[PDB]
């Protein structure tokens, strides 16, 4: 009923379960990729592996 007290009103619930396995990725954040700089000492990130 819409007249229920707040703890007895309906709530929509979503659980975003994440898994990254010993495997490729298929979902990613909005971040820009860039060119591959070989042979120099570089900071890097591949698919979130910093």
């Amino acid at each position: 009923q819409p007249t229920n007290g707040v703890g007895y009103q309906p709530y929509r619930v979503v659980v975003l379960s994440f898994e990254l396995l010993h495997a490729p990725a298929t979902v990613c954040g909005p971040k820009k990729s860039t060119n591959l700089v070989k042979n120099k000492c570089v900071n890097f990130n591949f698919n979130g592996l910093t």
């Binding site: 010993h22 495997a23 490729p24």
Partner: peptide, 24 residues
């Protein structure tokens, strides 16, 4: 009927490259 499997049915357990190593 039945048969002996011997050593058979081994597979790559994860998509990780490993070489010149023994892994458990």
């Amino acid at each position: 009927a039945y048969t002996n499997s011997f050593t058979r049915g081994v597979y790559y357990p994860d998509k990780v490259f490993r070489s010149s190593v023994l892994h458990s």
